[PDB]
Amino acid sequence: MLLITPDELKSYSVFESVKTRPDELLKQDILEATADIILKVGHDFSDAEYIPLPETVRLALLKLSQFYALINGDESIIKGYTTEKIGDYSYTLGDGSSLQKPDVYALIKDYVKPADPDLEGIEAKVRMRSI
């Protein structure tokens, strides 16, 4: 599971909403952000033997997290009065903009489910882990 500090988000995010947001929440939000990335790549970094944190993901999550956290604790942005945090055409800004998710697809596009066969280093680890 994503392991990015909530403070680090505010560190890069110069948003009061993101700043105000408590770490306790920032966590839930951050995780909620990864849920998207994880869905985008259709993979969840669980295996401790495969939990990379490139500038792309970190940035992708930082942006996503910054986006949501931004439309999370703001003035009085509209949102599913009886719904949860999503990524629709909601989050009406004070100006009247449909602030939607950011563009980090290209960021994860680097770590997006590629089109590779089962040629990857398989039957190698096991062969060893077995020994």
Short mmCIF file of N, CA and C in Angstrom, two decimals:
data_model
loop_
_atom_site.label_atom_id
_atom_site.label_comp_id
_atom_site.label_asym_id
_atom_site.label_seq_id
_atom_site.Cartn_x
_atom_site.Cartn_y
_atom_site.Cartn_z
N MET A 1 0.82 -1.20 0.00
CA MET A 1 0.00 0.00 0.00
C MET A 1 0.87 1.26 0.00
N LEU A 2 0.38 2.27 -0.70
CA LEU A 2 1.10 3.53 -0.79
C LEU A 2 1.69 3.88 0.58
N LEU A 3 2.92 4.36 0.55
CA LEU A 3 3.60 4.74 1.78
C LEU A 3 4.23 6.12 1.61
N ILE A 4 3.37 7.11 1.44
CA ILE A 4 3.82 8.48 1.27
C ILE A 4 3.27 9.34 2.41
N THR A 5 4.19 10.01 3.09
CA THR A 5 3.82 10.87 4.20
C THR A 5 2.81 11.92 3.74
N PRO A 6 1.90 12.29 4.68
CA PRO A 6 0.88 13.29 4.39
C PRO A 6 1.48 14.70 4.36
N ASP A 7 2.52 14.88 5.17
CA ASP A 7 3.19 16.16 5.25
C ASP A 7 3.90 16.45 3.93
N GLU A 8 4.45 15.39 3.35
CA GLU A 8 5.16 15.51 2.09
C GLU A 8 4.23 16.06 1.01
N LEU A 9 2.95 15.73 1.15
CA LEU A 9 1.96 16.18 0.19
C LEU A 9 1.81 17.70 0.30
N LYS A 10 1.70 18.17 1.53
CA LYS A 10 1.55 19.59 1.79
C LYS A 10 2.86 20.30 1.45
N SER A 11 3.95 19.57 1.61
CA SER A 11 5.27 20.12 1.33
C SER A 11 5.36 20.54 -0.14
N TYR A 12 4.74 19.74 -0.99
CA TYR A 12 4.74 20.02 -2.42
C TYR A 12 3.48 20.80 -2.82
N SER A 13 2.45 20.65 -2.01
CA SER A 13 1.19 21.33 -2.27
C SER A 13 1.12 22.63 -1.46
N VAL A 14 1.00 23.74 -2.19
CA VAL A 14 0.92 25.04 -1.56
C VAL A 14 -0.55 25.43 -1.39
N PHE A 15 -1.37 24.43 -1.11
CA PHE A 15 -2.79 24.65 -0.92
C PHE A 15 -3.15 24.62 0.57
N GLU A 16 -3.91 25.63 0.98
CA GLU A 16 -4.33 25.73 2.37
C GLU A 16 -5.24 24.56 2.73
N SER A 17 -6.06 24.17 1.76
CA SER A 17 -6.99 23.06 1.97
C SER A 17 -6.21 21.78 2.26
N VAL A 18 -5.14 21.58 1.50
CA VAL A 18 -4.31 20.40 1.67
C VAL A 18 -3.50 20.54 2.95
N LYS A 19 -3.13 21.77 3.26
CA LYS A 19 -2.35 22.05 4.45
C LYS A 19 -3.21 21.79 5.69
N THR A 20 -4.39 22.40 5.69
CA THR A 20 -5.32 22.24 6.80
C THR A 20 -5.61 20.76 7.04
N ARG A 21 -5.94 20.07 5.96
CA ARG A 21 -6.25 18.65 6.03
C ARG A 21 -5.31 17.96 7.01
N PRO A 22 -5.92 17.19 7.96
CA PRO A 22 -5.15 16.47 8.95
C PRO A 22 -4.48 15.24 8.34
N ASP A 23 -3.35 14.88 8.92
CA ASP A 23 -2.60 13.72 8.45
C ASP A 23 -3.51 12.49 8.45
N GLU A 24 -4.34 12.42 9.48
CA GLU A 24 -5.27 11.30 9.62
C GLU A 24 -6.13 11.18 8.37
N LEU A 25 -6.59 12.32 7.88
CA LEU A 25 -7.42 12.35 6.69
C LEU A 25 -6.54 12.22 5.45
N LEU A 26 -5.51 13.05 5.40
CA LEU A 26 -4.58 13.03 4.28
C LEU A 26 -4.26 11.58 3.91
N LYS A 27 -4.21 10.74 4.94
CA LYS A 27 -3.92 9.33 4.74
C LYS A 27 -5.06 8.68 3.96
N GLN A 28 -6.26 8.83 4.49
CA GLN A 28 -7.44 8.27 3.85
C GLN A 28 -7.57 8.79 2.42
N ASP A 29 -7.24 10.07 2.26
CA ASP A 29 -7.33 10.70 0.96
C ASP A 29 -6.22 10.15 0.06
N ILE A 30 -5.01 10.16 0.59
CA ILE A 30 -3.86 9.67 -0.15
C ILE A 30 -4.16 8.26 -0.67
N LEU A 31 -4.65 7.42 0.23
CA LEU A 31 -4.99 6.05 -0.12
C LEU A 31 -6.07 6.06 -1.20
N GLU A 32 -7.02 6.97 -1.04
CA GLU A 32 -8.11 7.08 -1.99
C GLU A 32 -7.57 7.48 -3.37
N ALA A 33 -6.43 8.15 -3.35
CA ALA A 33 -5.80 8.59 -4.59
C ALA A 33 -5.14 7.39 -5.27
N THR A 34 -4.42 6.62 -4.47
CA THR A 34 -3.73 5.44 -4.98
C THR A 34 -4.74 4.44 -5.55
N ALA A 35 -5.90 4.39 -4.91
CA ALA A 35 -6.95 3.48 -5.34
C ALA A 35 -7.21 3.68 -6.83
N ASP A 36 -7.05 4.92 -7.27
CA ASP A 36 -7.26 5.26 -8.66
C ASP A 36 -6.06 4.79 -9.49
N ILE A 37 -4.88 5.19 -9.03
CA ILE A 37 -3.65 4.82 -9.72
C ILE A 37 -3.57 3.29 -9.81
N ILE A 38 -3.88 2.64 -8.70
CA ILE A 38 -3.84 1.19 -8.64
C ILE A 38 -4.81 0.62 -9.68
N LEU A 39 -5.93 1.31 -9.84
CA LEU A 39 -6.94 0.89 -10.79
C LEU A 39 -6.47 1.22 -12.21
N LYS A 40 -5.77 2.33 -12.32
CA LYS A 40 -5.26 2.77 -13.61
C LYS A 40 -4.26 1.74 -14.14
N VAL A 41 -3.43 1.24 -13.23
CA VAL A 41 -2.43 0.25 -13.58
C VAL A 41 -3.00 -1.15 -13.33
N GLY A 42 -4.13 -1.18 -12.65
CA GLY A 42 -4.78 -2.44 -12.34
C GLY A 42 -3.87 -3.34 -11.50
N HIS A 43 -3.13 -2.70 -10.61
CA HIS A 43 -2.22 -3.42 -9.74
C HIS A 43 -2.05 -2.66 -8.42
N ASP A 44 -1.95 -3.43 -7.34
CA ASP A 44 -1.79 -2.84 -6.02
C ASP A 44 -0.44 -3.28 -5.43
N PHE A 45 0.41 -2.30 -5.19
CA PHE A 45 1.72 -2.58 -4.63
C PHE A 45 1.61 -3.22 -3.25
N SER A 46 1.53 -4.54 -3.25
CA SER A 46 1.41 -5.28 -2.00
C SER A 46 2.73 -5.99 -1.69
N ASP A 47 3.15 -6.84 -2.63
CA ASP A 47 4.39 -7.58 -2.46
C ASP A 47 5.51 -6.61 -2.08
N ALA A 48 6.03 -6.81 -0.88
CA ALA A 48 7.10 -5.97 -0.38
C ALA A 48 8.31 -6.09 -1.31
N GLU A 49 8.30 -7.15 -2.11
CA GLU A 49 9.39 -7.39 -3.04
C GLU A 49 9.14 -6.64 -4.35
N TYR A 50 8.17 -5.74 -4.31
CA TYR A 50 7.82 -4.95 -5.48
C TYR A 50 6.98 -3.73 -5.09
N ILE A 51 7.62 -2.82 -4.37
CA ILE A 51 6.94 -1.61 -3.93
C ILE A 51 7.82 -0.40 -4.24
N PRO A 52 7.98 -0.13 -5.57
CA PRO A 52 8.79 0.99 -6.01
C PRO A 52 8.06 2.32 -5.79
N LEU A 53 8.84 3.39 -5.71
CA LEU A 53 8.28 4.71 -5.51
C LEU A 53 9.05 5.72 -6.36
N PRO A 54 8.80 5.67 -7.69
CA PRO A 54 9.46 6.57 -8.62
C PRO A 54 8.88 7.98 -8.52
N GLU A 55 9.56 8.92 -9.17
CA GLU A 55 9.12 10.30 -9.16
C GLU A 55 7.79 10.44 -9.90
N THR A 56 7.54 9.49 -10.79
CA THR A 56 6.31 9.49 -11.57
C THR A 56 5.11 9.20 -10.67
N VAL A 57 5.19 8.08 -9.97
CA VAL A 57 4.12 7.68 -9.07
C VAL A 57 3.96 8.73 -7.97
N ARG A 58 5.07 9.00 -7.29
CA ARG A 58 5.07 9.98 -6.22
C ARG A 58 4.43 11.29 -6.69
N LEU A 59 4.78 11.67 -7.91
CA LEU A 59 4.25 12.90 -8.48
C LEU A 59 2.79 12.68 -8.87
N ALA A 60 2.52 11.51 -9.44
CA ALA A 60 1.17 11.17 -9.86
C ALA A 60 0.25 11.17 -8.64
N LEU A 61 0.76 10.59 -7.56
CA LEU A 61 0.00 10.51 -6.32
C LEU A 61 -0.04 11.89 -5.66
N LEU A 62 1.10 12.57 -5.73
CA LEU A 62 1.21 13.90 -5.15
C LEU A 62 0.20 14.84 -5.82
N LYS A 63 0.09 14.69 -7.13
CA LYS A 63 -0.83 15.52 -7.90
C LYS A 63 -2.26 15.10 -7.58
N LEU A 64 -2.52 13.81 -7.70
CA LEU A 64 -3.84 13.27 -7.43
C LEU A 64 -4.25 13.64 -6.00
N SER A 65 -3.36 13.34 -5.07
CA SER A 65 -3.62 13.63 -3.67
C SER A 65 -3.83 15.13 -3.48
N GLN A 66 -3.03 15.91 -4.20
CA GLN A 66 -3.12 17.35 -4.12
C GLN A 66 -4.44 17.84 -4.71
N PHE A 67 -4.89 17.13 -5.73
CA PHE A 67 -6.14 17.47 -6.39
C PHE A 67 -7.34 17.21 -5.48
N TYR A 68 -7.43 15.97 -5.01
CA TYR A 68 -8.51 15.58 -4.13
C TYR A 68 -8.49 16.39 -2.83
N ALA A 69 -7.35 16.32 -2.16
CA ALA A 69 -7.18 17.05 -0.91
C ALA A 69 -7.55 18.51 -1.12
N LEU A 70 -7.40 18.96 -2.35
CA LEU A 70 -7.71 20.34 -2.70
C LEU A 70 -9.23 20.52 -2.73
N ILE A 71 -9.90 19.55 -3.33
CA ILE A 71 -11.35 19.59 -3.44
C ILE A 71 -11.96 18.74 -2.32
N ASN A 72 -11.22 18.66 -1.22
CA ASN A 72 -11.68 17.89 -0.07
C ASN A 72 -12.04 18.84 1.07
N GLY A 73 -11.07 19.66 1.44
CA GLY A 73 -11.26 20.63 2.51
C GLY A 73 -11.10 22.06 2.00
N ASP A 74 -12.02 22.45 1.13
CA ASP A 74 -11.99 23.79 0.56
C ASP A 74 -13.15 24.61 1.12
N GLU A 75 -13.27 25.83 0.63
CA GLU A 75 -14.33 26.72 1.07
C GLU A 75 -15.63 25.94 1.25
N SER A 76 -16.36 25.79 0.15
CA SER A 76 -17.62 25.07 0.18
C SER A 76 -17.90 24.46 -1.20
N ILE A 77 -17.01 23.58 -1.61
CA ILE A 77 -17.15 22.91 -2.89
C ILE A 77 -18.29 21.90 -2.82
N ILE A 78 -19.06 21.84 -3.90
CA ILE A 78 -20.18 20.93 -3.97
C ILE A 78 -19.66 19.51 -4.20
N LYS A 79 -20.45 18.54 -3.76
CA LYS A 79 -20.09 17.14 -3.91
C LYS A 79 -21.24 16.26 -3.42
N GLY A 80 -21.24 15.03 -3.90
CA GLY A 80 -22.28 14.08 -3.52
C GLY A 80 -22.71 14.30 -2.07
N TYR A 81 -23.78 15.07 -1.91
CA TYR A 81 -24.31 15.36 -0.59
C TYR A 81 -24.49 14.08 0.22
N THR A 82 -24.70 12.99 -0.49
CA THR A 82 -24.89 11.70 0.15
C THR A 82 -24.01 10.64 -0.51
N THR A 83 -22.97 11.12 -1.18
CA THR A 83 -22.05 10.22 -1.86
C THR A 83 -20.63 10.39 -1.29
N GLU A 84 -19.75 9.50 -1.72
CA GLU A 84 -18.37 9.54 -1.27
C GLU A 84 -17.50 10.27 -2.30
N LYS A 85 -16.20 10.27 -2.03
CA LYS A 85 -15.25 10.92 -2.91
C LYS A 85 -15.10 10.10 -4.19
N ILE A 86 -15.32 10.76 -5.32
CA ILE A 86 -15.21 10.10 -6.61
C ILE A 86 -14.37 10.96 -7.55
N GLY A 87 -14.70 10.88 -8.83
CA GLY A 87 -13.98 11.64 -9.83
C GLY A 87 -14.89 11.98 -11.02
N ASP A 88 -16.04 12.54 -10.69
CA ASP A 88 -17.01 12.92 -11.71
C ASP A 88 -16.83 14.40 -12.06
N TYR A 89 -17.90 14.98 -12.58
CA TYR A 89 -17.88 16.39 -12.95
C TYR A 89 -18.33 17.27 -11.79
N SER A 90 -18.17 16.74 -10.59
CA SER A 90 -18.56 17.46 -9.39
C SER A 90 -17.45 18.43 -8.98
N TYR A 91 -17.32 18.62 -7.68
CA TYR A 91 -16.31 19.51 -7.15
C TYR A 91 -16.39 20.89 -7.80
N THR A 92 -17.58 21.47 -7.74
CA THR A 92 -17.80 22.79 -8.32
C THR A 92 -16.98 23.85 -7.58
N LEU A 93 -16.12 24.51 -8.34
CA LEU A 93 -15.28 25.55 -7.77
C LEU A 93 -16.10 26.83 -7.60
N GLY A 94 -15.55 27.74 -6.81
CA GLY A 94 -16.22 29.01 -6.55
C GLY A 94 -16.38 29.81 -7.84
N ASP A 95 -15.53 29.49 -8.81
CA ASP A 95 -15.57 30.17 -10.10
C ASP A 95 -16.60 29.49 -11.00
N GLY A 96 -16.82 28.21 -10.73
CA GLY A 96 -17.78 27.44 -11.51
C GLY A 96 -17.06 26.49 -12.48
N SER A 97 -15.92 26.00 -12.03
CA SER A 97 -15.13 25.08 -12.83
C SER A 97 -15.31 23.65 -12.33
N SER A 98 -15.40 22.73 -13.28
CA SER A 98 -15.57 21.33 -12.94
C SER A 98 -14.21 20.68 -12.69
N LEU A 99 -13.55 21.15 -11.64
CA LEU A 99 -12.25 20.63 -11.27
C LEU A 99 -12.30 19.10 -11.27
N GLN A 100 -11.63 18.51 -12.26
CA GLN A 100 -11.59 17.07 -12.38
C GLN A 100 -10.19 16.54 -12.05
N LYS A 101 -10.10 15.23 -11.94
CA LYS A 101 -8.83 14.59 -11.63
C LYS A 101 -7.73 15.20 -12.50
N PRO A 102 -6.47 15.12 -11.99
CA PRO A 102 -5.33 15.66 -12.71
C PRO A 102 -4.95 14.76 -13.89
N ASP A 103 -3.78 15.03 -14.45
CA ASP A 103 -3.29 14.25 -15.57
C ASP A 103 -1.96 13.60 -15.20
N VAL A 104 -2.06 12.46 -14.54
CA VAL A 104 -0.88 11.73 -14.12
C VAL A 104 -0.85 10.37 -14.82
N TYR A 105 -1.74 10.22 -15.80
CA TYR A 105 -1.82 8.98 -16.54
C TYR A 105 -0.51 8.68 -17.27
N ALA A 106 0.09 9.73 -17.80
CA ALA A 106 1.34 9.60 -18.52
C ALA A 106 2.46 9.26 -17.52
N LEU A 107 2.25 9.69 -16.29
CA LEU A 107 3.23 9.45 -15.24
C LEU A 107 3.25 7.96 -14.91
N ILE A 108 2.05 7.40 -14.75
CA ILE A 108 1.92 5.99 -14.43
C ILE A 108 2.02 5.17 -15.71
N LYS A 109 1.80 5.85 -16.83
CA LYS A 109 1.86 5.20 -18.13
C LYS A 109 3.19 4.44 -18.25
N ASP A 110 4.17 4.90 -17.49
CA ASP A 110 5.48 4.28 -17.50
C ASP A 110 5.43 2.97 -16.72
N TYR A 111 4.55 2.94 -15.73
CA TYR A 111 4.39 1.75 -14.90
C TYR A 111 3.01 1.13 -15.10
N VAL A 112 2.41 1.45 -16.24
CA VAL A 112 1.09 0.94 -16.55
C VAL A 112 1.22 -0.48 -17.13
N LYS A 113 0.25 -1.31 -16.79
CA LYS A 113 0.25 -2.69 -17.26
C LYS A 113 0.67 -2.72 -18.73
N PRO A 114 1.96 -3.10 -18.95
CA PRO A 114 2.50 -3.17 -20.29
C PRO A 114 1.98 -4.41 -21.03
N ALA A 115 2.44 -4.57 -22.26
CA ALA A 115 2.03 -5.70 -23.07
C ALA A 115 3.20 -6.67 -23.21
N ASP A 116 3.52 -7.33 -22.11
CA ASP A 116 4.61 -8.28 -22.10
C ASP A 116 4.07 -9.66 -21.72
N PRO A 117 4.66 -10.71 -22.36
CA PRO A 117 4.24 -12.08 -22.10
C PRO A 117 4.78 -12.57 -20.76
N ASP A 118 4.78 -13.88 -20.60
CA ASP A 118 5.26 -14.49 -19.37
C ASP A 118 6.75 -14.82 -19.52
N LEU A 119 7.44 -13.98 -20.27
CA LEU A 119 8.86 -14.17 -20.50
C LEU A 119 9.65 -13.63 -19.30
N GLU A 120 9.01 -12.72 -18.58
CA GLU A 120 9.64 -12.11 -17.42
C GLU A 120 10.36 -13.18 -16.59
N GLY A 121 11.28 -12.71 -15.76
CA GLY A 121 12.05 -13.61 -14.91
C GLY A 121 11.12 -14.44 -14.02
N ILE A 122 10.64 -15.54 -14.59
CA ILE A 122 9.75 -16.42 -13.86
C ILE A 122 10.42 -17.79 -13.69
N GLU A 123 9.96 -18.52 -12.68
CA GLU A 123 10.51 -19.83 -12.40
C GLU A 123 11.96 -19.72 -11.95
N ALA A 124 12.38 -18.49 -11.72
CA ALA A 124 13.75 -18.23 -11.28
C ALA A 124 13.76 -18.06 -9.76
N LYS A 125 12.96 -17.11 -9.29
CA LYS A 125 12.88 -16.84 -7.87
C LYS A 125 12.47 -18.12 -7.13
N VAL A 126 11.35 -18.68 -7.57
CA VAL A 126 10.84 -19.90 -6.97
C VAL A 126 11.96 -20.95 -6.92
N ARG A 127 12.46 -21.29 -8.10
CA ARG A 127 13.53 -22.27 -8.21
C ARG A 127 14.54 -22.08 -7.08
N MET A 128 14.75 -20.82 -6.72
CA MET A 128 15.69 -20.49 -5.66
C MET A 128 15.01 -20.55 -4.29
N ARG A 129 13.97 -19.74 -4.14
CA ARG A 129 13.23 -19.70 -2.89
C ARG A 129 12.90 -21.12 -2.42
N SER A 130 12.85 -22.03 -3.38
CA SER A 130 12.55 -23.42 -3.08
C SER A 130 13.77 -24.10 -2.47
N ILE A 131 14.91 -23.90 -3.12
CA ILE A 131 16.15 -24.49 -2.65
C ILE A 131 16.34 -24.17 -1.17
#
